[PDB]
């Protein structure tokens, strides 16, 4: 898994990151959203099924939705209305698992990209 798009932005605006995988397999996994801000522990955002179903993290006001094109190999993470506190590493992750509250937690995912940085800053 190869997650991109990172990159320095101003609050208030909008950054979509893409990840995409390699090989044939990519429409028999869910794929989750995670973060690890400066000073936090990883936080999970958003995370879609392979029906394409989103699940939201339990606290996170709706500002990150995401979609899949599976033909592409890539699933994509919108975040709406950056705040600083979205400064961290995203990492996009995939699971055999259905659309549950499963999808929620990171033991549930099988494979893990590299990241890529965001930056929020005025």
């Known amino acids: 898994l190869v997650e991109s798009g990172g990159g320095l932005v101003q609050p208030g605006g909008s950054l979509r990151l893409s990840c995409a995988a390699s090989?044939?397999?990519?429409?028999?996994?869910?794929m989750g959203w995670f973060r690890q801000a400066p000073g936090k522990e990883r936080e999970f955002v958003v995370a879609?099924?392979?029906?394409?179903?989103?699940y939201d993290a339990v606290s996170l006001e709706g500002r990150f939705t995401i979609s899949r094109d599976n033909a592409k190999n890539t699933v994509y993470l919108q975040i709406n209305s950056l705040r600083p506190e979205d400064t961290a590493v995203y990492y996009c992750?995939?699971?055999?698992?259905?659309?549950?509250?499963?999808?929620?937690?990171?033991?549930?995912?099988?494979?893990w990209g590299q990241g890529t940085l965001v930056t929020v800053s005025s």
């Open positions: 090989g044939r397999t990519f429409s028999s996994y869910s």
């Open positions: 879609i099924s392979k029906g394409g179903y989103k």
């Open positions: 992750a995939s699971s055999r698992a259905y659309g549950s509250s499963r999808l929620r937690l990171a033991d549930t995912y099988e494979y």
